[PDB]
């Protein structure tokens, strides 16, 4: 986990004999209050507070800009925020860095013409092709006021959350274990996308590596014994749906439990390395693959032979195991690298674990009535989607964590012991269906609680354009029990279920629930706790990824100010024109 910094640049009128001297304290204060707002509100994925760096002085002339640049170059700065209460000399004071985002906050004061600077400097940004965000508060503030108004706070934090996400991805790897899974497009990994858009490397390991490590004892035998004991005490094996001649013996199931535990360990060791392996004499394997995110191909070649990836996938994505409560390791079923990245976006913006799901079924009010006799009401009234992965899901996806008596998913450092216990208590692990997964294993089964606000998210590669992002804010649903059971028993009752209704807006692909499904670009989605659409739109514009589809209110759209120059009326097309022209950060 990197600690990318936000660089705060206090710019000032350069002229002295009184002018500059009298603005110094106010200008330096704006910088310090942004730093405080950020460091006391946001945290890195590891729970540490976000770190900021202020320029070595206020910036009135270019050599002060160069000094700031010098300091930032070596303080691991992933983005800048310029703050000012006054007029400053635009092109002499601006940050020229083309590979990171920039935001300018201009104080809305009258003696304090920060807004004139704001607009002038953003004009330079747009003219010189260096995208920058503009942060202007609705209400004139007194020259003395040091409160950051709420509209300003909101823009600053949104900008900062998205910037930090770009900073956390940069220079990390995606690891593939295996390759293409059952001709799924997202499993045909495109390194140009990772490299150009995300600043990321691609690593790769054939699944044979698992076998090698199991056969030769390349994992921690002490951990294994603690894991086996923990699993027996905490993991409840579920109902075996297998037909008579496919049902495994108690002995063979017990062996498979040992196997999937070692899978989890090896998967995790592959991603992030493990000091213990160096102690055991496997110095090369100890380093890992520097993976901020990864996937397991599984089907068909591995799952035809050996226990499936469900246990490994579930637990990497879950915020605890026998070693205690912890960050998740963002992990893609079927090596769907695009779903992995979709989950990664959500994860880095929220510090919360991520649901991987097949978008399995659209249930219309009509089909529910025919099948169950029940007329849908409330949030479910317009129909809904069955979100269900083929065996694995973050246990946090139960929705068993709670805030104000409402279901949520939490960053790991906020998880209480009773919440973790409730997640386990409400989860089952049915043996794998051996008509699909000959090699065996155990899937994960639970039902996500209703009434949880969530965002479903997907990146798709469009040939000759690149990645495009789709976003659907909505709510999890609680169906009447007999209705849930009917719909479930008829689909895949060995797997975990989330019932999802997207918010409809009457525009675009959100006129009906069917249209949301009909416009979804893959079999998979990434689903996070929270309504994070506006954050995703902001992140997307930083990465020059167009948004093909979202249900976020237009007034929450926050993009660099030069997008505006591509159009104010057809925001979608303006977004494609801007992303098209600017291209990916690292091309
Ligand atoms: Mn799938």
UniProtKB/Swiss-Prot annotation:
Cofactor: Mn(2+)
Location(s), subcellular: Cytoplasm
Enzyme class: isomerase
Catalysed reaction equations from the record: L-fucose = L-fuculose
GO biological process: D-arabinose catabolic process; L-fucose catabolic process
Enzyme Commission code(s) on record: 5.3.1.25
InterPro entries per record: Fuc/Ara_isomerase_C, Fuc_iso_dom3_sf, Fuc_isomerase_C, Fucose_iso_dom1_sf, Fucose_iso_N1, Fucose_isomerase, Fucose_isomerase_dom2_sf, Fucose_isomerase_N/cen_sf
Active-site residues per Swiss-Prot or TrEMBL entry: 334, 358
One protein family per Pfam: Fucose_iso_C
Keywords: Carbohydrate metabolism, Cytoplasm, Fucose metabolism, Isomerase, Manganese, Metal-binding
Recorded family membership: Belongs to the L-fucose isomerase family.
Protein role: Converts the aldose L-fucose into the corresponding ketose L-fuculose.
UniProt-recorded name of the protein: L-fucose isomerase
Organism in which the protein naturally occurs: Streptococcus pneumoniae serotype 4 (strain ATCC BAA-334 / TIGR4)
